[PDB]
Amino acid sequence: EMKPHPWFFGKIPRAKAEEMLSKQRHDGAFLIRESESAPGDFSLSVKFGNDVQHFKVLRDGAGKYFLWVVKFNSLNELVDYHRSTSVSRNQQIFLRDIEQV
Ligand SMILES: [Cl-]
Ligand code: NA
Q: DSSP E strands: which ranges in 18-100?
A: 30-34, 42-48, 51-56, 58-59, 65-66, 71-72
Identify which of 72, 55, 76 has the alpha carbon closest to the alpha carbon of residue 64. Answer: 72
Way the structure was solved = X-ray
Domain around 45: 1-101
Counted domains in the chain: 1
Resolution as reported, in Å: 1.9
88 CA distance to ligand 1 centroid (A)? Answer: 8
98 CA distance to ligand 2 centroid (A)? Answer: 21
81 CA distance to ligand 1 centroid (A)? Answer: 10
36 CA distance to ligand 1 centroid (A)? Answer: 29
Residues 6+ apart with CB under 8 A from 75: 8, 32, 42, 57, 65
Q: Which CATH number goes with the domain that contains 10?
A: 3.30.505.10
